[PDB]
């Protein structure tokens, strides 16, 4: 009977952190007389990730200093330079790595002081003079925000009440949301997708602002994009609706419905496919489809799948965008997030974990080192009777260990 | 020997002196040249 | 029994034999062709491969 | 065409096994180039049990193109609804009419190291009567162990190349001969290769 | 003269990857070792693919809300079957019902462990009938989905 | 000019390469190696020479050394094959293939029973039939689809240490491969 | 003068990308690709 | 450079080793293989 198995995730790849985990010593009670219970201890090492391709380069040579449209034009400067940071590659370059990077601060510091430009005595964010307000612009600058949040700083109290005023005011008591700022389905269409992206704005805010008011009106929006996903509406909705679904709970039984169904939608080219893409028109400055690709690409990479993210970047690398997308930047910064998620996942699969397996009571068994060229391991076998728990130190990868029990019972 | 699939499909005539046109030219003496370009071939595309 | 249990190896020359990129016993088409069948690639002014 | 074409055919079991004592013919047709045929002389012989492979030769003349025989088995337990029968094409060698060929087929039986061996090549039909020279090479596990080269004389129609044997060669080998000749408009080798037990 | 004088054109530049000319085809289609295996009850197979290869196993979790409990790990057998060991999902938490959404229900959580009760009323008017007050003791819950209460005045 | 070579060339091997002149009344040639870029690689090159003595026919051996573009989408890259000649010149692509060498796996049993060592050596060799001294791992399988993976480095005769039979055998036809898991093909497979 | 003049270049990287153009549709020797349905009905569709 | 076709020294070899092929000059772009002795 094996009985016992877990993967140990060292980085907490997968749900929680599991690194270190106890297996029970038990006897049965149907246990043969002079009989000694043996077990046998292993690892698999799964698979790594592909390396494919990942390239962005010429953005801060054509676009970096050069009316309304300068948070478009310091927006994509954040992601720039959270893909270099991920991505740890900067001798491309043959300046100093340190000037770069502080020209790159200081850009981001007048990205901040424009943002803090755009926010209004309501502590709304508008884009226009602030005469109107609108939710979407404001959704935005919560995502830039919360991508500011890991680098630098961020105010918290103008973080918060900026998200009271959306649950206060734009939250429906169904879970919708909408903007004040301006086919009966179109309208309903509309609503779930200014409520996807609203959940987006506050899930990406809502990790340095924790509160219960904020997670009752998330639990509130993910409980009407589940009950309204039901009927296939759109590509660009449905993505857009599994990835806001997916900065959540990623186990959620309707949500893994509607990534099934999202999955069903998605068109491949060759067998097996080379290329994943999803389109929105069906028998259809003119590629609208990137949109959703690249929703359904951070979707995918929510859930730690190489396999099926790496079509879609293969696609994302070359195809007939050209490029090809909007606004932008609405689908620009999400393919630099993919692209650096991709990056990041690829760089969590190292197989560095130092596996040391080791008694409760008693001195240790066996020590395993795990690397890239030896990703197997040789079984040993347990004698000695006590409780068996297997750990690691930080470690860098994903492996699973395998523990049988033989035991001789009568019979 | 054995000719199948219709050779030339019953084509016949060529245009009347297409010769003198695909031959050579010069511009000094205003006279006419030898042929450069083969215009007699049809690579098989019968065009009628 | 083993279905046999025929040996360790057996075999020393019959596995080196693997190492002909060609088929066949010989001969064949026009020079091109038996080339290849024999293995090789020919590289001259007259005739192609 | 014109020379002897041996033919060896094995018989094997329904599972991976060679059989022996089986007796067998084959029925040919010699086609000419030109014109009608007519039916080759059927043959028949049996298989050796310590051989395993059935030998024939046949001779045709010098203007057939190809071949076709049917192998069959001969036995007085078989039936003629259940018989084994397979049938087989041979095409010969050229725009400049010119052949090449290597004999004896290493029916030696195959030869071991130290002792040289002489080979029958004929330039049967050749561009021109003057040939500049041989050129022979031998080949073994994917590699040029050895390049041969001749001297073309009037003295006969066909002439004998010695080749020595070295202890690289023991498992298999190839050996392909090719002459060049010069043609008045544009030029043309002719090529042939037999296997080397 | 007739014609236009200005011609207003689009422009960002927002593909900075570049890696070649890609050859394009005419259009696409949805859809053209062991195979994909049944999992058991709520599913929820990991890093799921299309063909498993020879000896490679891939382990199952217990979809929310449930927990895994004993062998959870599938191995691809030489033939095209699955060896299916031992294990199943207890339910550790229930989760908020999404009956309507006139609740609004006390208490209004993301997950109830086994023992809390839960309560729902229809405001400010009147009320549907029915059951009011109902824990989740991991039972496999019942409540109406079309009819729930739909209360009425 | 006839240029007579390989179809398929091997990585790490001696190639060689004979070229042939229709005669004349002595110019030198000149062959060389390059990868896929035309412009700008280079492998090895080649230098022959030509006489009455040598009746215009020489051959010169060429290698295929571990030079390609480390990673990559595919480390092929096959040949670009080149001739220097006063008369002539041409170029012409040829596959190649790190097939190199062969793999002789000997054990001392065909049975094993449980809690039984294993002593298994590896014959390392060329295509010249030369040892090869090379680095080599070896993978055992379970008969019912990974066991363990252990590397050494090569004498000729590539001596491994006796595995052990873990406490629950699985009963059937095991599997043994070798590689040599650097750059090479032709992994060998033991029953 | 020519306006523009092309010269052997150094290829990086040489033909690629090449496959059968046509999928569900007949494929004729010079290279048109035309609907199975016009083949053999007694018209030179193809050209050649 | 005109349309192809239109020195390093002997290298030393390390102790209780031996260069398989000698020469007075090798082309650029050559390569040599080196030997152990017996034992």
């Known amino acids: 009977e094996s009985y016992s198995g877990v993967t140990l995730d060292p980085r907490g790849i997968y749900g929680t952190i599991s690194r270190r985990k106890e297996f029970p010593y038990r006897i049965p009670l149907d246990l043969v007389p002079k009989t000694e219970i043996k077990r046998i201890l292993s690892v698999k090492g799964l698979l790594v990730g592909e390396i494919l391709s990942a390239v962005l380069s010429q953005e801060g040579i054509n676009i970096l200093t050069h009316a309304e449209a300068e948070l478009m034009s310091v927006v994509p400067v954040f992601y720039v330079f959270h893909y270099l940071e991920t991505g740890n590659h900067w001798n491309i370059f043959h300046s100093d790595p340190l000037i770069e990077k502080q020209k790159l601060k200081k850009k981001l510091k007048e990205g901040m002081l424009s943002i803090m430009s755009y926010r209004n005595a309501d502590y709304s964010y508008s884009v226009w003079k602030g005469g109107s307000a609108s939710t979407w612009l404001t959704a935005f600058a919560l995502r830039v925000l919360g991508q500011v949040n890991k680098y630098v700083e961020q105010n918290q109290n103008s973080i918060c009440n900026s998200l009271l005023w959306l649950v206060e005011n734009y939250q429906l008591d169904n879970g919708s949301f909408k903007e004040n700022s301006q086919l009966p389905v179109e309208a309903r269409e509309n609503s779930l997708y200014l409520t996807a992206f609203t959940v987006i704005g506050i899930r990406k805010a809502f990790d340095i602002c924790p509160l219960v008011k904020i997670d009752t009106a998330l639990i509130k929006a993910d409980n009407f994009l589940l009950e309204n996903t039901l009927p296939a509406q759109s590509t660009f909705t449905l993505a857009i609706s599994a990835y806001a679904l997916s900065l959540g709970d990623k186990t959620h039984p309707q949500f893994r419905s509607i990534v099934s169904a999202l999955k069903r939608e998605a068109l491949v080219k060759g067998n097996p496919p080379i290329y994943r893409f999803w389109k929105d028109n069906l028998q259809h400055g003119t590629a609208r489809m990137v949109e959703t690709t690249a929703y359904a690409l951070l979707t995918s990479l929510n859930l730690k799948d190489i396999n099926y993210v790496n079509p879609v970047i293969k696609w994302l690398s070359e195809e007939q965008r050209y490029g090809g997308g909007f606004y932008s930047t609405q689908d620009t910064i999400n393919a630099i997030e993919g692209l650096t998620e991709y990056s990041l996942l690829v760089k969590q699969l190292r197989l560095s974990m130092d596996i040391d397996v080791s008694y409760k009571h008693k001195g240790a068994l066996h020590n395993y080192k795990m690397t890239d060229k030896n990703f197997l391991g040789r079984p040993v076998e347990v004698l000695l009777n006590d409780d068996l728990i297997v750990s690691t130190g930080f470690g860098s990868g994903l492996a699973t260990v395998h523990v049988t029990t033989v035991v001789h019972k009568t019979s | 020997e054995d000719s199948e699939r219709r050779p030339s499909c019953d084509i016949d005539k060529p245009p009347p002196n297409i010769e003198l046109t695909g031959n050579g030219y010069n511009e000094l003496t205003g006279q006419f040249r030898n042929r450069v370009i083969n215009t007699k071939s049809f690579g098989g595309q019968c065009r009628k | ?49 | 065409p014109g020379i002897p074409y041996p033919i060896k055919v094995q018989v094997k079991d329904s599972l991976d096994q060679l059989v022996g004592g089986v007796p067998v013919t084959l029925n040919a047709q010699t086609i000419d180039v030109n014109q009608e045929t007519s039916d080759l002389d059927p043959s028949k012989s049996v298989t050796r049990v310590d051989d395993g492979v059935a030998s024939f030769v046949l001779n045709l003349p010098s203007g057939v193109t190809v071949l076709e025989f049917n192998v069959k088995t001969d036995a007085p337990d078989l039936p003629e609804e259940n018989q084994a029968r397979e049938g087989y094409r041979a095409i010969a060698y050229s725009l400049s009419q010119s052949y090449l060929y290597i004999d004896w087929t290493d029916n030696h039986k195959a030869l071991l190291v130290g002792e040289h061996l002489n080979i029958i090549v004929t330039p049967k039909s050749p561009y021109i009567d003057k040939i500049t020279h041989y050129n022979y090479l031998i080949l073994s596990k994917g590699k040029i162990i050895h390049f041969g080269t001749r001297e073309k004389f009037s003295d006969a129609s066909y002439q004998s190349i010695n080749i020595p044997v070295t202890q690289n060669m023991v498992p298999s080998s190839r050996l392909l001969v090719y002459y060049i000749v010069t043609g008045e408009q544009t030029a043309e080798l002719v090529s042939d290769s037999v296997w080397l037990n | 003269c007739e014609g236009e004088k200005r011609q207003e054109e689009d422009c960002t530049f927002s593909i900075m990857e570049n890696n070649g000319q890609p050859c394009i085809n005419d259009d696409e289609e949805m859809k053209e070792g062991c195979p994909q295996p049944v999992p058991p009850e709520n599913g929820f197979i990991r890093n799921e693919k299309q063909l498993y290869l020879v000896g490679e196993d891939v382990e199952i979790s217990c979809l929310t809300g449930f927990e895994t409990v004993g062998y959870q790990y599938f191995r691809c057998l030489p033939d095209g079957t699955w060896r299916q060991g031992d294990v199943e999902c207890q339910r550790t938490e229930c989760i908020k019902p999404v009956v309507q959404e006139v609740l609004t229900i006390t208490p209004f959580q993301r997950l109830y462990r086994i023992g809390e009760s839960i309560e729902l009323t229809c405001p400010k008017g009147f009320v549907v009938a029915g059951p009011s007050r109902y824990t989740c003791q991991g039972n496999s819950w019942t409540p109406p989905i079309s009819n729930s209460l739909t209360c009425e005045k | 000019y006839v240029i007579s070579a390989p179809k398929i060339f091997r990585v790490g091997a001696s190639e060689n390469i004979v070229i042939q002149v229709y005669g004349y009344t002595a110019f030198d040639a000149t062959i060389s190696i390059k990868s896929y870029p035309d412009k700008k690689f280079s492998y090895s090159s080649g230098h022959v020479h030509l006489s009455s003595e040598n009746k215009f026919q020489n051959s010169a051996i060429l290698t295929i050394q571990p030079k390609q573009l480390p990673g990559g989408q595919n480390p092929v890259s096959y040949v670009y094959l080149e001739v220097v000649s006063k008369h002539f010149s041409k170029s012409k692509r040829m596959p190649i293939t790190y097939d190199n060498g062969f793999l002789f796996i000997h054990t001392d049993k065909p049975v094993y029973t449980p809690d039984q060592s294993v002593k298994v050596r590896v014959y390392s060799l060329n295509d010249d039939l030369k040892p090869a001294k090379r680095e080599t791992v070896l993978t055992f399988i379970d008969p019912e689809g990974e066991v363990d993976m252990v590397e050494e480095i090569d004498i000729g005769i590539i001596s491994f240490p006796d595995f052990k039979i873990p406490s629950n055998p699985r009963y059937g036809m095991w599997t043994i491969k070798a590689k040599y898991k650097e750059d090479f093909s032709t992994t060998g497979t033991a029953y | 003068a020519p306006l523009v003049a092309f010269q052997p270049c150094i290829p990086s990287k040489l033909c690629k990308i090449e496959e059968a153009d046509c999928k569900n549709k007949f494929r004729c020797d010079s290279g048109r690709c035309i609907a199975r349905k016009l083949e053999c009905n007694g018209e030179n569709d193809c050209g050649d | 450079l005109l349309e192809p076709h239109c020195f390093c020294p002997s290298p030393p070899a390390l102790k209780d080793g031996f260069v398989q092929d000698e020469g007075t000059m090798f082309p650029v772009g050559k390569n040599v293989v080196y030997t152990c002795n017996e034992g």
Do not use: I, W, Y
């Not at chain 3, 075999?11 to 064949?28: I, M």
């Not at chain 3, 038996?34 to 090789?40: D, K, N, Q, S, Y």
């Open chain 3, 1 to 49: 029994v083993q279905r046999g249990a025929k040996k360790p190896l057996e075999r020393v020359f019959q596995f080196l034999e693997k190492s002909d990129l060609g088929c066949g016993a010989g001969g064949g088409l026009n020079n091109a062709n038996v080339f290849h069948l024999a293995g090789l690639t020919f590289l001259t002014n007259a005739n192609a491969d």
